[PDB]
Each structure stands twice: as C-alpha cells, then as structure tokens.
Amino acid sequence: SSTLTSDQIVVTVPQKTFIGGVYNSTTLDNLDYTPISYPLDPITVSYSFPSDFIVDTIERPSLSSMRASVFKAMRAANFSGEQSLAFDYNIKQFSYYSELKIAFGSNVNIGKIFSIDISGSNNKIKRTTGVFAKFTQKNFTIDMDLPADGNIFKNNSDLALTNGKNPVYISSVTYGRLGIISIESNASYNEVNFALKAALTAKKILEESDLSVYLVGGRGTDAVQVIKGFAGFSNFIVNGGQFTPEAPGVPIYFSASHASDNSVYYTTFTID
Amino acid sequence: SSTLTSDQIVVTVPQKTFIGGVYNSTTLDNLDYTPISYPLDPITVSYSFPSDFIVDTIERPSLSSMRASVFKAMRAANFSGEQSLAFDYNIKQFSYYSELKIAFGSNVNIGKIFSIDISGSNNKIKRTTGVFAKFTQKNFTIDMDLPADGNIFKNNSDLALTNGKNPVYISSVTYGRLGIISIESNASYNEVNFALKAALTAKKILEESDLSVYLVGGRGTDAVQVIKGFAGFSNFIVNGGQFTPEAPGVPIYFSASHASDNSVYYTTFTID
Amino acid sequence: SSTLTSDQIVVTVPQKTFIGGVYNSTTLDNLDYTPISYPLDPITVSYSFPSDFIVDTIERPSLSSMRASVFKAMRAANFSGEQSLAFDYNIKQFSYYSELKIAFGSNVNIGKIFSIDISGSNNKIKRTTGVFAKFTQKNFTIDMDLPADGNIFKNNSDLALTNGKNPVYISSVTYGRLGIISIESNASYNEVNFALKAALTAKKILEESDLSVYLVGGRGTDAVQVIKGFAGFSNFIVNGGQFTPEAPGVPIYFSASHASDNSVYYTTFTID
Amino acid sequence: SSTLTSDQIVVTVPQKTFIGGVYNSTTLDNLDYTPISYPLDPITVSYSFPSDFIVDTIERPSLSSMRASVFKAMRAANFSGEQSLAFDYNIKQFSYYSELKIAFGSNVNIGKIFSIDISGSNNKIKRTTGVFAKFTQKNFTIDMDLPADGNIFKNNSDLALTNGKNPVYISSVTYGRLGIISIESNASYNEVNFALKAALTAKKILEESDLSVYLVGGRGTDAVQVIKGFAGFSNFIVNGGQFTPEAPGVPIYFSASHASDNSVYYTTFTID
Ligand SMILES: [Ca+2]
Ligand SMILES: [Ca+2]
Ligand SMILES: [Ca+2]
Ligand SMILES: [Ca+2]
C-alpha cells in the first residue's frame, strides 16, 4: 500500500548487528543478513557517553569485540549515565498489524514480536479499535569513524569484486530500551485513548480489552511488574531512566553506510 | 491451513541445542535433529550480560563446553543480572491446539507440552472458548562470531561434500523463562478474558474452567506455588525478574545460520 | 484407537535407564529393554544445574557410574538447586485407563501404576466420571555430548553388525518429581472439577469418590501426608520445589538417539 | 509549496556530524551525507564554555577526536556550565507534518521523528487542530578557526579536483537539549493553546488529545517522567538548565562552510 525509507534500521538479529559488520543491502531489506566475507582495516569507534575511555580501536570487527569494548568503556572511570541521547513516546492508533512496524521504524516480524497470525486476511485487528502506547529511550551510541583511505576494506580492491552484492557496513549501533503496550478493544477510540492516558498518568474498557506488552531492555525487576496492571508499565518507564554499567541496554537501532561512497544507507520497507 | 516462517526457533531438544551444533534444516523443520559430523574451526562466543568474562573461545563445539563457559562467565566478577534482554506477555484466544504453537513461535509438540490428544478430530478445544496468558522473559544470550574465513568447517572443503543435506549451524542461544496458563471454559470470551485479567492483576468461571499450566525455568519455589491459585502465577512472574548465577535460566530460543553464505535461517512451520 | 509419537520417553525400568545405555527401539516400544552388548567410546556428560563440577567423563556407561557422577556433581561446591527446569500441572478428564498414559507421555503399565485390572472390558472407568490432577517438576537433566567421530561404538564397525536390531542409545535423563491424584466419581464433571480445584486451592463428592494417588520422588515426609486429605497433596507440591543434594530426585524422563545418524528417537505408543 | 534557507543545519546523522567533516552540499540538502575523502590540514577548535582548556588542535578531523576533545575540555579545571548559549521556546500551531520541520529549522525525517506516516495524503493532521510546544537550549558550541592559507585541504590542490562535487566542511557544532510535546485535538485552537499554556505554567482536551513527545538530550531521569503527565515536561525543562560534565549534551545543530571561499553555507529545504 505504501513504501517508507529510513536511515535508522531496527535491530532484528543482535547476533549479526555489530559495529563494522558488512552486509548486502537487498538482504537487509529482505530482513535477511548475508555477510560480505572480506578482511577489513582496523576501525576506530567512539562512545556517546562521557568516560575516561571513549576512543577504541578494533582490529577485527566482531560482536564479541564490540561487546568487550562497550563493557570496558562503561566500566572505565569518570563514567556518567545520567544523560541519555533520546526519549520518544507516543500513543497512536493502528487498524492493521503490518502498519505497526511504523512504530518500530523499519522492517520487523510483527508475527514474532506479538504471538499472532498476520498472513492472509488476519492482518486486520480482531477487535474494533487498536491503540498502542510506545516508548523508546536511547541512552548512548557507538559510532565508527570514516575510513582514512575512503575504503573500509583492507586490500582496497575488494570493491571491484563486490559488484551486484552491494556492500553495506554497519557504522553506528544505538543502545537503549523499548516498550509497547498494544491494546485491542471494541469501544470507541475517543474513550480508549482517554482510558489509556488516564491509566498511564494515574476503567471497564481497560479490563475488557486485549493486552499485548513487549519490552526490550531495562530492569527486569521493573519489567516483570507490568503484569500487575497499568502502573507496572509506567514504573518501567519512570524507573531506570539513568543507565548504569549494571544495566547498559540492548542494541535497538543501527545505522549503515554504502561502503563505496561512504554515504548513509536508507533501508526501504513496504506496508500493506 | 497456513504456513509461518520465523528466525528464532524454539528449543525442543536441549541435549542437541548448543552453540556451534550443525544440523540439517529439513530435519529441524521436521522437528528431528540430524547432526552433520565434521570437524569445526575454533569458535568465539560472547555473552549479552555484562561481566569481566564475556569473550570465550571453544575449540570443540559441544553442549558441555557451552554449559561450562556459561557457568564460568556468570560466576566471573563484575557480573550484573539486573537487566534482562526482553519481556513478552500476552493474553490471547485459541480455538485449536495446533495454532497454540504460534505463542511459542516455532514447531512444537503441543501433545507433549500439554498432556492431551491432538491427532485426528481432537485438535479443536473440548470446551467452548480457549484463552491463554503467556509470558516469556529473555535474560541473556550467547552469540557466536561469524567465521573469519567465511566457512565454519575446519577443512574448508566439507561444504562440497554436504550437498543435499543443507548444513545449518546454531549461532545464538537464548536463556530465559517461559510460562503459559491455558484455560478452557464454556462461558463467553468477553467474560473469560475479564476474569483472567482480574485474577492476574488482583470468580466462578475461573473455578469451573479447565487449567493447563506449563512453566520453563524460573525459581522452583515460586513455580510450585502456581497450584495454590492465580496468585501463584503472578508471583512466579513478578519474582525472579532479575537473574542470578544461582538461577541462570533454561535455553528457550536459538538462532541458526546457513553455513554456506552465513545468512540467517528461517524455519517454517505449518498450522492446520 | 490412536497412535502417538513422543521424544521424551518415560522411565519404566530405572535399572536399565542410564546414560549411554544402548537398547533396541522395537523393544522400547514393546516396553521391553534388550541391550546391545558392544564396547562404547568414553562419553562426556553435562549437568543442567550450575555447579563447580558440570562436565564429567565416563569410560564405561553404567547406572552405577551415572549415579556416582550425579552424586559427586551435586555434592560439589557452588551448587544451586533454586532453579528447576520445568513444572507442568494439569487437571484433565479421563474415561478410560489406557488413555491415562497420555498424562505420563509414553507407554506405561497403568495396571501396575494403579492396582487395577485393565485387560478386557475393564479398560473403562468403574464410576461415571474420571478426573485426575497431575503435576511433574523437572529439576535438572544429565545430557551426553554427541560422538566426536559420529559413532558411539568403540570399534566404529559394530554398526554394520547391528542390522535388524536397531541400536538406540540413551542420550539424556531427566530428574524430577511426579504426582497424580486420580479420582473416580458418579457426579458430573462440572462439579467434580470444581471440587478438585477448590480442594487444591483451599465437599461430599470428594468424600464419596474413589481416590488413587501415585507419587514419584519428592520428600517422603511430605508424600506420606497425602493420606491425611487434600491438603497433603498440595503441600507435597508446594514444599520441596527447590531440590537439594539431600533430595536430588528420581529419573522420570529420558531421551534417546538413533546411534546411526545420531538423530533423536521418537517412541510410538498406541491408545485404545 | 515553499522553500526555506537556513545556516544552522540540524544534526540528522550524529555519526557523520563532526567538526572538520567535508560533505557535498547537494547530499546534505538531499539529507544524504557523502564525504569528500581527502587529507586535511590540522585544525584548531575552540569552546564556548569557559575552561582552562579551550583551544585544541586536531591533526585528523574525526568524530572520536571531537568527542575526546570535548570530554577533556569539559573535564578540565575552572569549567563553568552555569551560563548557556541560547534558549528558544515557542508554542505554535501546525496543520501539516511536512511544515513541522520549520520548528527544527532544517530538513528532517518527521516520519521517523514521530512514528507516523506522511507519504501521500497523510501529510495532513488526523485530528482537527494540531498544536506543539517546542524548546531548544544550546549550552555551548565547538567552533573551528578558518584556514591560515585559505584552503582546508592539506595538498591545497584538491579544490581543482573537487569540481561538481561541491565541498562543504562542518565548521561549528552546537551542543544542547531539545524537546517537543506535539498535540492533536478535535477542539478549537483558542482553547487547546489555553489548556497547553495552563498545563505548562501550572482539563478534558488535554486528556482526550493525542500526544507525541520527542526529547533529545537532557537528564534521563527527568525525561522519563514526561509520561507521568504535563508536569514531567515542565520539570524536564526547568531542571537541567545548567550543563555539567556528567550531562554535556547531544549535538543538535551544526554550521557549514563552502571550503572554496570559506563563506557560510545555507542549506535549503522545501515544505509542501
Ligand atoms: Ca581500507
Ligand atoms: Ca573454516
Ligand atoms: Ca566411536
Ligand atoms: Ca590547507
């Protein structure tokens, strides 16, 4: 029905979403992740949060190296997690599940995010109205410097070999928490949104409506209290605003570059 | 009736679901697990949780090696289990048992998960309405780095031999807790869901309905209290949110890769 | 009337259900246990519970070796029994005794589990309605690594000799507690289930109904209190949730592998 | 519908918005970022905030170098964050989403800033009236001195090579916090603005209206309290006015120069 382009791609495979990973763009749009196996020059990475250890060098770009560097940087002295990078929060209405990927911002498997069936005629909401409140807090980012020679490859000649398989290397990874409290009801949206806002900022619709809660990151003790009612979600948001070495966060978003002109990559996702 | 594809396959055989295990894809879809017996290069693994011991090397990928590495990593100093990875929770409606595998996310033996008969005309629920509340908390993951040479095999020539038997190696394993409180009743869903939500967030339908509770992982002391009523399940969820070395968790989900292009593997399960 | 296939076979002969035991599949389906007498390569075993002693090596697979290894592993330091592996609990209805083996999950001798006669026309319940509440707590498992050379035999040539007698070696053994409180009554199921649930979560039907209690494992002091009423069974479940070296548990379930392709074995049991 | 030119471009890619970065102007207007890979002379940078370490020299202009220099300058002695650089705050009305980029000041992806769809006929607001209160606090800036020889390149001859690809180097980067509390309602603007101003400076419209909150920078503890109501946003503004080394701020605005005559660059963005 529509197509959307975004530069901040959502983290669908954490095993393969690491700094310096090179992947084909068509595969990323398809939601696959096909790596381009070629040696890379040593890369330089920097951290948004202030600490005595910000600049790091990685000889071999790998997820283990990225995780170890993040751990040591956040364990370094003079580290402050009091300031975050961004905090988005919105209560919107959805009538299809395929359009719920707009909230995430890129191509996602909603059928696995929420234990539902979407294929076929089930893309429409079972109930009458579908509302959802979503929040996304970005604490810090790891960003990688552009290549000194203009090519990320170590031989500087694999670009000619990689024709047809468009190289695209991950340049940035965003760490933070995410949460959605999707609600399906048979009442009117004017009252469903009123009840949702009252519950979040403080009766029968919220008790007769279908709930679908999905949380990424954050304190587990606060996250598990969501089942206790609508105060649990607001406590999961209010608490844990400041990130600590104990609770760094889970990679939620990542940015990509074209590996040829080193420009930014815009993923494309279609919504029906 | 329908087919679904998912990248996070559910752990059906814990004995064979270990990091680096190579298995045929057709067998995994069939729910069998046929290993590809061939030497593998030493692998590098990383842990989602922050600790002084994150990066590990495994010469021979095996379940005992994975378990020992997980134990030593979680016993290492500067370990924090306060932050989890994900927390999904939903109360949905099911009218068949074969479609209950949507909640798990992959092909499962519901006939062995719940002590029922599904084969034949028994796939439909015995009672009128079937509801179920399910929760899944993912605490941490072990993820393995992509091969440096692009091939996971140690001879780099077994790929030619393994034609027809599509190699697929386990790249990630998810640790966490899972729980379902499936309920069958003769009343209306509008009241059954209301009663379930009231019991979880706080009378005759819940006492005259058929119960089916299935829990994976978590504290045993909290899990055994589920039989005491509906407060036991909510206490099993609320308590044990933060994972500790005493209670690491049971592997619930795992991701797979194609071992030829090192892309992600999407398992396929049909629902009738 | 129906046939069922399951991968988690129930422990019918504890003397012969040990890790590494090789038995014919036809015999296991028949409920016999015919060993395949052939030397085996040394095997590696791992334990689900966290302890300083997880990985063990067994030169000669035997029940005494398995028991000694389990004892020493659970007596090792840094052992935590606070987390279990699974906890299933369901209150179902049965109208035949042959179909009561669905609750166990494999072929069992119900005629010896409950001191009744099933052969002939006695397979039906004597009373009008038959209900049963069953619980199964799995604390930990011992699992054995796949053979390095792909063959479990020590000569690597006994596979050719073992044709017709399909080799099947036990790969995993599950330790835990089990319990069933089978009830036969002349009233309606809608009231029998109500009374059972009220008694378990807290009058004449439960006192005029026929009782059949079967418990495997758990604390003996709590198990013997079942005869005192319906609070004894709920106390046997609530207490002893956390397993200790004093009360490890009895092998209740075991998994098997085909010893040729090392795939998982699915036992088949028919229900009439 | 209209075109606007501004000299303070908004930070859309923090990974590529660093001091000394050279990018094509057409790409910046397109919202792409294509770097001009050429060696640069060592640059001199200065900091708006008063500290013992103000003047810095950067041999290789990179994001990691800029971040490290900012960290060390703000950690230097005799640093005062009591005085900021600017504080803009306005409550305006918007009837389209494409015109909401006027508040930011340059070309932005409103479709990713707010989880909405804009492409096609959805550019209009779903509700009747659209109001928004926005605040932007600029604490300090890093500014780079003009080249001594009049050319930023290190060979002083790459200007002839870079014809057609108009070089444009980032000269200044603004650090600060930003926030918008966009509101959609069905009432009249005369009452919606009244309610918004009363809530910010202190009932049914604000509870039945659709909320869209977007915050960049600032204290996370204060930012997460926005969900609690309208006092959270006013507390996020009132608190954290003075910037500290613990909470420096996120780059929100940057200025650019033409790299040929060293004049200021005016980006152009169209609004429909
Ligand atoms: Ca290079
Ligand atoms: Ca290899
Ligand atoms: Ca052998
Ligand atoms: Ca120059």
Numbering used by the authors:
A (entry chain O), B (entry chain P), C (entry chain Q), D (entry chain N): 94 to 295, 309 to 378
Task: Give excerpts from the publication.
(A) The cryo-EM map at 3.13-Å resolution of the prepore-like structure from focused refinement with C30 symmetry, revealing a circular oligomer with a pore inner diameter of 164 Å and a height of 59 Å. We built an atomic model of the full prepore-like oligomer into the cryo-EM map, which consists of 30 EaCDCLS subunits, each lacking the activation loop and preceding N-terminal region. A comparison of the EaCDCLS protomer in the prepore state with the crystal structure of the monomeric proform of EaCDCLS reveals that while the α-HBs remain in their helical state, the β5 strand of the core D3 β sheet has undergone a complete β-to-α transition to create the HTH motif as observed in the membrane-inserted form of CDCs. This HTH forms a small α barrel within the interior of the circular oligomer. Thus, loss of the activation loop and corresponding β0 strand, together with the transition of β5, has allowed for the β4 and β1 strands of the core β sheet to form oligomeric contacts between adjacent subunits. This corresponds with the canonical oligomeric rearrangement and interactions observed in CDCs. Comparison of the core β sheet between monomeric EaCDCLS and the prepore-like structure also reveals the loss of the twist observed in the monomeric state, with a slight rotation and straightening of the β1-β4 strands. Therefore, we hypothesize that the stacked rings are “prepore-like” structures composed of act-EaCDCLS protein alone, similar to the circular prepore intermediate observed in CDCs. However, any putative physiological prepores would be expected to be composed of 1 EaCDCLL molecule and 29 EaCDCLS molecules, similar to the transmembrane pore, but such a short-lived intermediate would not been captured here because of the long incubation time of the experiment.
